[PDB]
Every structure is written in structure tokens, then in C-alpha cells.
Amino acid sequence: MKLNVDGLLVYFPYDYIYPEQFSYMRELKRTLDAKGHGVLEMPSGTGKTVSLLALIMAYQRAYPLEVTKLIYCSRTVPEIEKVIEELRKLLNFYEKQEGEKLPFLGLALSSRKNLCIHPEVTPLRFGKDVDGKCHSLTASYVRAQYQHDTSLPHCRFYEEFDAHGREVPLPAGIYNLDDLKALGRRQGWCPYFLARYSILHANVVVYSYHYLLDPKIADLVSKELARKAVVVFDEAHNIDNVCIDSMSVNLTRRTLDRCQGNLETLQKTVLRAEHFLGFLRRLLEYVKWRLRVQHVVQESPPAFLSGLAQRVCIQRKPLRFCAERLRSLLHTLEITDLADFSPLTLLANFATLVSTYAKGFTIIIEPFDDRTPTIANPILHFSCMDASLAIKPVFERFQSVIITSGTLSPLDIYPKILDFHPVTMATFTMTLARVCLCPMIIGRGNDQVAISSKFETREDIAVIRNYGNLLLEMSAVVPDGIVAFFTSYQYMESTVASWYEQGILENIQRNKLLFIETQDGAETSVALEKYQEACENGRGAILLSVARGKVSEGIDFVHHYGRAVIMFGVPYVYTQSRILKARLEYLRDQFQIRENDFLTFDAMRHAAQCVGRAIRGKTDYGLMVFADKRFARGDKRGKLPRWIQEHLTDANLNLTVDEGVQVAKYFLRQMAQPFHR
């Protein structure tokens, strides 16, 4: 309804507003009035978007000049479609409660493969070739040659959009990605091109994080759209990880083999300017020097360019021209397709990065491979070390950058992990008619022996028996879905092997079905598919996976799915590969970040993120356990989000397996009774 905030009225589709929603609206209004950045933390995946959009629309109506463009970057495409449909529902509610339309446009952005109408490119599963084929079908040279109307198969959506779609705007009517595709196919236009034309004349727009963190595409998609704009990154608990991965590249034997294979074709095309023709010829052999050198690690971010001017004696100046060479030399060469050409492109990007960005970076070479370490594998990876580089451009181009997710417990580490000036420090804890979660930390087992997943005790027989023993009675108290996360696959495979060797794993089998998540995506999908139907009926199942895996955050455990989430030990990232330690050293002498605290912060962030996916919706409920005494310490409990801290009573912090079962039985028994909305 018409919620009356201290200086505005905001229409809300839902008549009932929770106190958490009202407090969040108050905080967001205060932040907008402060004209500054901020950080937010809410535990509701649903219901946050509607309130955010309602307050954004109210602020735009009240202050059209203060706010002009809104960005709602998310992590995946399902988030984009759900926020789009929520915005559509909000617009329908506003229309039915007000009676007149408004000139608001809302569009969703995705990749070329997602937004395309040609049936000759949809079936293929090459994400790096769809853009190249689209460029080959239509480009500047295609437009130039279309005047003569040459008879050749090519895309014609742009050839009609440039004459028809560049005049008629879309002042009203928010269009989803499927709606945009339908409009493009009925008007003979490309959805991507019409989106690129209509972003300027639009009210809101949604897309992924990669369109802003990546400097090679953020400028193209957002250069002078709006100096004063509001951007929000919902579900950005791992924003630092993606920011680091944005400027992270890898090299292997396949890349260099592809480059040496395609340079011959490039030379053959050329022989049919000269400053770069011979420039790239001797670049491949410089990095192949490390191929013949058998060394553990070489670190020299400043001296890497200095050493380049020794073997071949090339100045640093031409390296910066590689970025602009792509749009000049390549388009004149008329490359048929990006196939067998992508590794060549990243080499130019790699050269520009080392030449320009070397203050907070480090070059790492590691000749180690899984189960075949020393055969042949000199791996060069320009791993980033500072997360501020990927976030600096957006902070100076925007005024009210907001970071929010379901797990942002430490609000004092994000402003120092990346250069930030928070003025909010706001946390919210959801409340219902009953406690929907029962977090508890299990310490010593029934034998009064700690079950901590310590590195020196991974092979211990006493601890591994308790882990199976804990899962035994737990499988018989919480039905239809239990999700268990392990530290790593190597620890996971050794865990089940010990259980299989003993006569204990078979007892779990007759209660619930044991499903193991593997690295293969196809095998994971079918395993998840049978898990969903196993929990659908009364047979039940157990989902075993890893905390740092694609399945931990790729799926959401809605109610009746995964009623219990089990964390077998504190998930600590492996210290090998000499990558994390490089980041630890950089943060040590730059941001004064404690090495132990950052590892604890990273360990608890992933642990709290995955365990927080069992509560989606007010009516949803679930069980949360921690199979490690290390969680019981105050330094790690404080790293849990505030909406879980108050429900984690001090009575159950070191209780045994048998005590934990009794708490679970009591909690689930009283949570099945009917309630009121």
C-alpha cells in the first residue's frame, strides 16, 4: 500500500509490510539522502527486490533530477528474469492502483547467444564463437557492402533496424528478454542492437556483474549514460572473488599451440601495419623460454617488462598500442571468424596489463597438474592481487554504490579489502511468528573426541567414524533432504572410502539415498535431477558436495528440499599453488589485513553462504549444523551473519552428536504445526 516514509509516499503491492522491510526502506532513504555509497545485509532472497524497486520508483518520482539511471546487476540469468517479472508485477500494481501510465522503460541485457534470433547459431554451444559469427555476419564492412546488395548469406536484422528501429523509441512498456526477442523478430530487428539503442532512453536496466567489473566491456556498455546514477549489486557476497577473477588470465600448452598454429594463417592472410606484423612474431618465443626452464616459481611483476627488453630489447611503449590494434589491424584484415583466434587476442590484453598494471599484481608460474604434476605443464597465470582495481572505475563514476547480499557479516573488512567509504553499517535480521532456523555447533562426538577437520587429523580414524556416526542418526531425524558440504574433493573421496570400508555407510543407505556431486557438470545435473525427485517422495536422499563448488551457489534449496545443511569442518581454501599466499602478503603490508583473519573470513563466508540457502521464503524452515569445534570459538561465530547470531544460543555450542539429535528432533517436531500469516 501507500507507505508513508518521513518525506515521501511509496506504493507497495503487498498490504502487509514486515518491520525488517520498513527498516530497510528507512536505511535506503537515508543513504539516498546522504548522496553516498553504502553496504546492506538482508536474509531474504525474495521480498528484497520488490521493496528496492518500489523505493527506487518513489525516489525517482519525488526527485527526477537526483536519480536518472538505475542498475540492478545480479549474478546469473534466473536472477535477472525474476527481478524483471517482479518489476512487471510492480508496474501492473501501480497501473491498477493509479490508472495512468508512466514513461518508464525496463530492459534486460545478456550475451549475444542469449539474445539472438538466427536459428543457425542457437543450437551450437560455443560461447566464444557466437560473437565472432555475429560480427562476421554484420559489421562495418557488411554495412558498406550492403549498398551494392551483394548476394551472400548474412544477418539482416541490423539492415532493417538501422532504417526503422533507430527512429521509433519505447517510452513506455517494460520488456523482458523474451519480450525483446519477440519484438525483434516481429519487427525484423536484433534484440542486442535495439537494446544498445534504447539503453540511452530508458529508466531501469538489468544485466550481469561481468558487464561492469570487466574494463573491456564496462566502458562500451556504460560510458556517459548518467553521471549521477544508483547501482546495486544484490547477492554480491563474493564480489571480491569475481573482481579478482576479472583481471585473471591463464596460459597453457593448448593456448601457445593454438597461437603458433594460427600465426601462420594470419601471415598467409597478410601476404595477400608493418609496425605490428613482425612485433608479434617474436613474442611467442619469449614466453616459451619458461617452457624449457624447469623452475618452481618466478615472481617479478616490475622486472617482467624489464626482462622483456633484454632477450629481444623491445621498448615498453608499443605494448600499450596492442589494445587499440584490435579495432584497427584486425578489421582491415577481415578475419573470417574468431575460431582459432581467441588465444591470440588475450595475449595483447596480457601485454597491456603487465605494461600498465603492475603496482598490485604478481606473475606466478606453476608446473603442477592434477595427478600428473611433472610431465609437461609450465602454466603462466597473471593472477590479480588487489580487488580495488576492478572497483575503482565504478566508484568515481557513481554516487550511491550499494553492496548487498545474504552474507555480509563483517562490515569492517570490505571497506579495507577494497577502497570504500561506507556510511551505513546496516544489518537486518528477519523475524517471523516462529524461529525458522535452528543453528547449532557440534563439538566433541559421543566418544568425547573432537571432530574438527584439522589437516593433521584428516587421516585419523577416530574423527572419521564420528562424522559417519553423526550422519547416521541425523539421516533418521530430518527427512526429505540433507545437504552436506566438505572442505575439498580430495577430503570428500577419502571420507566416503573410510565409511565404505567400515560397516557404517550401508546403514545410511537404507535410510536415505547417498548422492555424490562430481566435477562433471552433466553427471552433477542428473545427480541433482534424481535428488529432486527423491526428496519429492518419502524415500529421501543425501546430497554430498564441496563448499567451494559450482553446486554450492548454483542451486537454491527451497523448502522441503534440503531441510538440514551439514558443514563437515571449517572450509579452508588450500594454501598450495602459491596464489593465496601472494594475496595474503599483499594485504599484509598494504591494508594491514591479518593473515589468519582473512583465511577465517574466507572460510566463514563460504560456510555461511551455503548454509544460508536453506531458508528461502517466510514459510520456509530448515536445520543448520556445524560439525567442527572450531566454529564454537568466538572469533568464528562473530563471522556469521547477524540474522543467524541471535538464533545461535550459547547453550548449544559444544554439544555432542547425541545432544544435537535431540535438539533437531525437538525443533522439527514443533515446526510442523500450522501457523498464521
Partner 1 sequence: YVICEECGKEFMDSYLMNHFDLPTCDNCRDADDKHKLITKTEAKQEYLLKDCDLEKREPPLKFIVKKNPHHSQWGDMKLYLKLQIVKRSLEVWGSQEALEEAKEVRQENREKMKQ
Q: Where along the sequence are the contacts to partner 1 (CB under 8 A)?
A: 585, 588-589, 592-596
- Least CB distance to partner 1 at residue 591 (A): 9
Query: Which residues does 390 contact at the CB level (< 8 Å), separation at least 6?
Result: 213, 215, 243, 244, 246, 247, 384
Restricted to residues 435-464, the positions that interact with ligand SF4 (CB under 6 A) are none
Quote the cell numbers at residue 557: 534449496
By CB under 6 A, tell whether 116 contacts ligand SF4: yes
Nearest residue (CB) to ligand SF4, 164 versus 288: 164
Contact 74, 82 (CB under 8 A): no
Query: Which residues does 120 contact at the CB level (< 8 Å), separation at least 6?
Result: none
- Least CB distance to ligand SF4 at residue 189 (A): 8
Nearest residue (CB) to partner 1, 178 versus 585: 585
Nearest residue (CB) to partner 1, 147 versus 592: 592
Binding partner selected for residue 589 from ligand SF4, partner 1, none, CB under the kind-specific 5 to 8 Å limit: partner 1
Which DSSP category does 648 fall into?
Answer: S
Quote the cell numbers at residue 215: 574494463
Binding partner selected for residue 97 from partner 1, ligand SF4, none, CB under the kind-specific 5 to 8 Å limit: none
Binding partner selected for residue 90 from partner 1, ligand SF4, none, CB under the kind-specific 5 to 8 Å limit: none
Flag whether 336 is marked binding.
Answer: no
By CB under 6 A, tell whether 157 contacts ligand SF4: yes
- Least CB distance to ligand SF4 at residue 328 (A): 22
Binding partner selected for residue 112 from ligand SF4, partner 1, none, CB under the kind-specific 5 to 8 Å limit: ligand SF4
Flag whether 540 is marked binding.
Answer: no
d(CA 250, CA 262): 19
Quote the cell numbers at residue 149: 546488395
Flag whether 45 is marked binding.
Answer: yes
Nearest residue (CB) to partner 1, 66 versus 595: 595
d(CA 582, CA 594): 14
- Least CB distance to ligand SF4 at residue 160 (A): 11
Flag whether 554 is marked binding.
Answer: no
Q: How many CB atoms lie within 10 A of CB 656?
A: 19
| Amino acid of residue 402 | I
Flag whether 48 is marked binding.
Answer: yes
By CB under 6 A, tell whether 154 contacts ligand SF4: no
Binder to ligand SF4 among 5, 77, 117, 573 (CB under 6 A)? 117
Nearest residue (CB) to ligand SF4, 199 versus 516: 199
- Least CB distance to partner 1 at residue 589 (A): 7
Binder to ligand SF4 among 112, 228, 316, 560 (CB under 6 A)? 112
Binding partner selected for residue 595 from partner 1, ligand SF4, none, CB under the kind-specific 5 to 8 Å limit: partner 1
Contact 213, 397 (CB under 8 A): no
Nearest residue (CB) to partner 1, 294 versus 592: 592
Nearest residue (CB) to ligand SF4, 144 versus 376: 144
Stretch that binds ligand SF4, among 78-86, 112-120, 355-363, 558-566 (CB under 6 A): 112-120
Nearest residue (CB) to partner 1, 558 versus 573: 573
Binding partner selected for residue 283 from ligand SF4, partner 1, none, CB under the kind-specific 5 to 8 Å limit: none
By CB under 6 A, tell whether 107 contacts ligand SF4: no
Give every strand in the sheet of 364-366, ordered side by side.
249-251, 379-382, 364-366
- Cα separation of the two ends of the chain: 17
Binding partner selected for residue 596 from ligand SF4, partner 1, none, CB under the kind-specific 5 to 8 Å limit: partner 1
Stretch that binds ligand SF4, among 87-95, 131-139, 329-337, 517-525 (CB under 6 A): 131-139
Three-state DSSP class for residue 677: coil
Q: Which of 213, 247, 602 is nearest to 417 (CA)?
A: 602
DSSP class per residue in 265-309? HHHHHHH--HHHHTTTTTHHHHHTHHHH---S----TTHHHHHHH
Restricted to residues 188-207, the positions that interact with ligand SF4 (CB under 6 A) are 190, 192
The HSE-up count of residue 145 (CA atoms within 13 Å, CB side) is 14
d(CA 514, CA 500): 12
By CB under 6 A, tell whether 104 contacts ligand SF4: no
Query: Which residues does 371 contact at the CB level (< 8 Å), separation at least 6?
Result: none
> What is the bridge-based pairing of β-strands 69-71 and 204-206?
parallel
Could you tell me the CA-to-CA distances from 410 to 39, 141, 470, 600, 639 in Å, in that order?
Answer: 11, 53, 30, 11, 6
Binding partner selected for residue 158 from partner 1, ligand SF4, none, CB under the kind-specific 5 to 8 Å limit: ligand SF4
Quote the cell numbers at residue 623: 536445520
By CB under 6 A, tell whether 158 contacts ligand SF4: yes
Flag whether 116 is marked binding.
Answer: yes
Flag whether 524 is marked binding.
Answer: no
Flag whether 46 is marked binding.
Answer: yes
Show the CA angle centred on residue 28, arms to residues 23 and 31, nearest 5°. Answer: 125
Flag whether 438 is marked binding.
Answer: no
Q: What are the φ/ψ torsions at residue 319 (nearest 5 degrees)?
A: -65, -40
Quote the cell numbers at residue 630: 572450531
Stretch that binds ligand SF4, among 114-122, 200-208, 405-413, 647-655 (CB under 6 A): 114-122
Stretch that binds ligand SF4, among 153-161, 427-435, 472-480, 565-573 (CB under 6 A): 153-161
Contact 80, 443 (CB under 8 A): no
Contact 517, 527 (CB under 8 A): yes
Flag whether 134 is marked binding.
Answer: yes
By CB under 6 A, tell whether 134 contacts ligand SF4: yes
Show the CA angle centred on residue 512, arms to residues 675 and 564, nearest 5°. Answer: 40
Stretch that binds ligand SF4, among 116-124, 223-231, 238-246, 567-575 (CB under 6 A): 116-124
Binding partner selected for residue 118 from partner 1, ligand SF4, none, CB under the kind-specific 5 to 8 Å limit: ligand SF4
Q: How many CB atoms lie within 10 A of CB 288?
A: 13
> What is the bridge-based pairing of β-strands 622-627 and 2-5?
unpaired
Query: Which residues does 420 contact at the CB level (< 8 Å), separation at least 6?
Result: 37, 39, 391, 395, 414
Nearest residue (CB) to ligand SF4, 195 versus 344: 195
- Least CB distance to partner 1 at residue 586 (A): 12
Flag whether 674 is marked binding.
Answer: no
Flag whether 618 is marked binding.
Answer: no
Helices (H), 612-640: 634-637
* Binding residue positions: 42-49, 116, 134, 155, 190
Query: Residues in the site for ligand SF4, rule: CB under 6 A?
Result: 112, 116-118, 134, 137-138, 155, 157-158, 190, 192
* Binding residue positions for [4Fe-4S] cluster: 116, 134, 155, 190
* Binding residue positions for ATP: 42-49
